[PDB]
Amino acid sequence: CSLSPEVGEGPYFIEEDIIRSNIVEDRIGIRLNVTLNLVDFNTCKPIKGAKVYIWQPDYSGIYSGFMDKPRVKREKMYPKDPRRFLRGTQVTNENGTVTFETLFPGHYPGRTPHIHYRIHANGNVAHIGQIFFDESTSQVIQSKSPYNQVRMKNEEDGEFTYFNGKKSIINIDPQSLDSLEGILNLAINPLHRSNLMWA
């Protein structure tokens, strides 16, 4: 129960209700279950009814909707393809929990591997961030197929450094090396209006 850090949205958010737990579609990689537990910063009690969005690139660093890897611009970015793999939304339960069935993310050049997330509560964009991986685990996974077929360090990454990525690393249960299980506990502020959206 300390306020989780926020991190810039980047350019590839797509504001669509795709409410599902399994976001893999046709993508290939290593299965990762991402469980996020949300509490209200103020009370430390779980937050119920919050919409959690995640989005991430596939193993070779492609984002669905931006598969033609277009030029990035400060002005509002619009997806060209209709694919939505590796994107989803889940609504927190009584316990403040959502779980997604995803893959370990690939990454871009000039970025460390991560999964984005954005949370709506009370019709406000309450919190935007990024999920990072412990260096040892990331190294293990990147040595396996298909991740090893195409890496900026956490500490080289502008976003990780500037926005406290250290407090935003997902905890992977090591014995889960059938499918990986990851837990990240977050404390957010449902009254906060984030200003970290791309537009």
- Contact code string over 5-44 relative to Fe ion, x by CB under 5 A: -----x----------------------------------
Nearer to Fe ion, 41 or 147 (CB): 147
Compute how many residues bind Fe ion; rule: CB under 5 A: 1
Neighbours of 114 (CB within 10 A): 27
Report the alpha-carbon distance of residue 169 to residue 171 in Å, rounded: 6
**H/E element holding 135?**
helix 135-142
Q: How far is the CB of 18 from Fe ion (least distance, A)?
A: 17
Nearer to Fe ion, 10 or 88 (CB): 10
Residue 106 in the binding site for Fe ion (CB under 5 A): no
Complete edge-to-edge strand list for the sheet that includes strand 87-91: 87-91, 51-55, 115-121, 124-133, 169-172, 180-188, 31-40, 97-103
Cβ(56)–Cβ(35) under 8 Å? no
Show binding-site residues for Fe(3+). 63, 108, 114, 116
CA distances from 15 to 70, 138, 144, 192 (A): 18, 28, 32, 19
Q: What is the DSSP string of 172-197?
A: E-GGG---EEEEEEEEE-TT-----S
Q: How far is the CB of 1 from Fe ion (least distance, A)?
A: 28
Nearer to Fe ion, 29 or 190 (CB): 29
Among the listed ranges 4-12, 15-23, 46-54, 149-157, the one in contact with Fe ion (CB under 5 A) is 4-12
Residue nearest to Fe ion (CB): 10
Q: How far is the CB of 26 from Fe ion (least distance, A)?
A: 20
Among the listed ranges 2-10, 16-24, 70-78, 144-152, the one in contact with Fe ion (CB under 5 A) is 2-10
Which two three-digit tokens encode residue 7?
């991190």
List contacts with Fe ion (CB under 5 A).
10
